[PDB]
């Protein structure tokens, strides 16, 4: 099992650096950044991390294909690439309507977007004169000066759809899924096979990544708390077959919802329970989360990101991932 | 007269870092790296600039408000400030119609579109939650969480046209002018100033920069021969009225356009005729370099920018103008 790493950079840069140096040398070896255009730029954040760091892999988690122009994401990760010496990975996935909505950008197809810009982005990165006549995306003799170290620079979607995990078996080198627990993955990977099968392809091709909410704590407890606030605001978010397949209390997470659309945080956390903690995140003691993700691995995740919080002391846990989690997986 | 320095990030940014430091050490007080998707991707680049220097004020030298959201070119702008310690500085013209052919982006009210993205730019800069209505540019709740460290970030727009000259003269903190001959000047600052006056500013307020071609060498022909390439694309860019104010042969121009649009250089090259580089480029000995930086002062020039190719050497070149140029003027 491969551990990744997930950051906003909502923080100075050089505190992000250090965790992330701190990650590398627990062994963590993905780095995954946001890319939302209320907090520090993704690729210069990742410049910074690339001159701190010196093995991890990295790269935004996830950009989108409407923010910059996909030629502009190509330059972009062939930049990062040739600075960390052959270490980019492309995390890409739709976006969201709510950004797109106050950005005033039209949130134009999305499947058939992300599939078109991810195929200009390789094109542009494998050294290609590119003339792309797309359903949506249109290129007309655009050719990068600049180039990655990498051959083939992965490509990792966000996927949390039917058609997007479809579409993510077919092209992309990983998956991202926002999940934690095994009964998400029972559904999601069979789609991603089916897509996988109908390019010709294996899924030994594929990283399944648990884009996961983690908490890691010596005490199983304080671990448990620690996760609430990010749980909060998966429940909320999640799509109805989603809280149908956990049995999640929909009058919950209606509260949850009410207080988060008026800021009243400790509001919404009164109304997280153990089954939104079971379903929504990893926790535990080290011991308890290396069984869960052994049970993630045993529906065909490859990679399981550490995400917010971590843990109760970002600091502590990533130490403890590294000495009693990582090396157990 | 202030200094400024521009380059294109087309190297290793290792090397592009030496060179701006190496700036810096000299007396250099701005630095300009030019935004084009095909390069490395200019924030990756200014933020190792910023990580290198300490003094040096940067930023691009232009973007522009199509290849990425003016949300987030706000952001970056606030990103670098934030990792220089409140040296960024933000260049910002129109784009050009090849390039947004080439990326399939519609060029949409160029005028009107930079002044909308330049308002919701320091709006966001500001801290303010924004909701703009603007002809072209529609902003709905959009806030940074990212703040610079500058109250308000210098906005210096590219503008070569009347219409965008009198723009920057009333919005602008400076103006990058693509000229290096006083006869350009004297045309244009009047248009900046009809802008200023019909905002009620003082041109005291606007830094008219230079954004030449320089070519500083001890030995003055060497000198004017490194000039030659540039010379050779300025002139075969230049719209009708530069070409008339200059007396240029336009035969020769149209021989360097052919030339150059197949990529014979060197026979592009053979076209260029001591009236393009008197009128195209500061070039020559430190000596000859003062005065015509001087006629520039008269004509109302505040900063000259040492843009391509610098001198035969660049690395030279740099160092000669801090020692027998800028302390002169």
């Not at 963590?28 to 950044?33: A, G, L, P, Q, T």
């Not at 690439?81 to 976006?95: F, M, Y």
């Not at 050719?143 to 058609?163: D, T």
């Not at 996988?196 to 990283?207: K, N, Y």
């Given at each position: 099992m491969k551990f990744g790493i997930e950051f906003v950079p909502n923080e100075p840069i050089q505190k992000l650096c250090y965790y992330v140096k701190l990650a590398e040398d627990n062994?963590?070896?993905?780095?995954?950044?946001?890319?939302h255009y209320n907090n520090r730029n993704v690729y210069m954040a990742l410049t910074a991390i690339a001159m701190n760091t010196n093995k991890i892999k990295l790269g935004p988690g996830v950009t989108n294909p409407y923010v910059r122009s996909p030629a502009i994401t190509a330059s972009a990760?062939?930049?990062?690439?040739?600075?960390?010496?052959?270490?980019?990975?492309?995390?890409?996935?739709?976006?969201?309507?709510?950004?797109?909505?106050?950005?005033?950008?039209?949130?134009?197809?999305?499947?058939?977007?992300?599939?078109?810009?991810?195929?200009?982005?390789?094109?542009?990165?494998?050294?290609?004169?590119?003339?792309?006549?797309?359903?949506?995306?249109?290129?007309?003799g655009?050719?990068?000066?600049?180039?990655?170290?990498?051959?083939?620079?992965?490509?990792?979607?966000?996927?949390?759809?039917?058609?997007?995990?479809?579409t993510a078996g077919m092209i992309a080198d990983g998956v991202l899924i926002n999940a934690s627990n095994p009964k998400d993955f029972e559904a999601a990977?069979?789609?991603?096979?089916?897509?996988?099968?109908?390019?010709?392809?294996?899924?030994?091709?594929?990283?399944?990544?648990?884009?996961?909410c983690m908490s890691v704590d010596k005490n199983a407890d304080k671990a448990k708390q620690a996760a609430v606030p990010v749980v909060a605001f998966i429940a909320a978010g999640s799509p109805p077959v989603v809280l149908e397949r956990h049995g999640i209390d929909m009058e919950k997470v209606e509260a949850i919802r009410n207080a988060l659309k008026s800021g009243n945080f400790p509001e919404a956390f009164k109304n997280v329970d153990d089954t939104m903690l079971e379903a929504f995140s990893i926790y535990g003691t080290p011991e308890d989360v290396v069984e869960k993700c052994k049970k993630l691995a045993e529906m065909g995740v490859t990679q399981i990101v550490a995400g917010s919080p971590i843990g109760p002391n970002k600091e502590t846990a990533i130490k403890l991932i590294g000495k009693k989690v990582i090396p157990a997986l």
């Open positions: 062994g963590f070896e993905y780095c995954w950044i946001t890319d990760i062939a930049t990062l690439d040739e600075l960390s010496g052959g270490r980019a990975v492309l995390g890409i996935g739709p976006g969201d309507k709510a950004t797109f909505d106050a950005l005033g950008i039209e949130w134009v197809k999305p499947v058939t977007t992300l599939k078109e810009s991810i195929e200009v982005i390789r094109k542009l990165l494998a050294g290609e004169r590119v003339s792309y006549e797309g359903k949506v995306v249109k290129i007309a655009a050719a990068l000066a600049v180039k990655p170290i990498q051959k083939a620079v992965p490509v990792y979607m966000g996927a949390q759809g039917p058609k997007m995990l479809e990977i069979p789609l991603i096979k089916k897509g996988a099968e109908a390019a010709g392809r294996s899924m030994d091709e594929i990283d399944v990544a648990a884009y996961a």
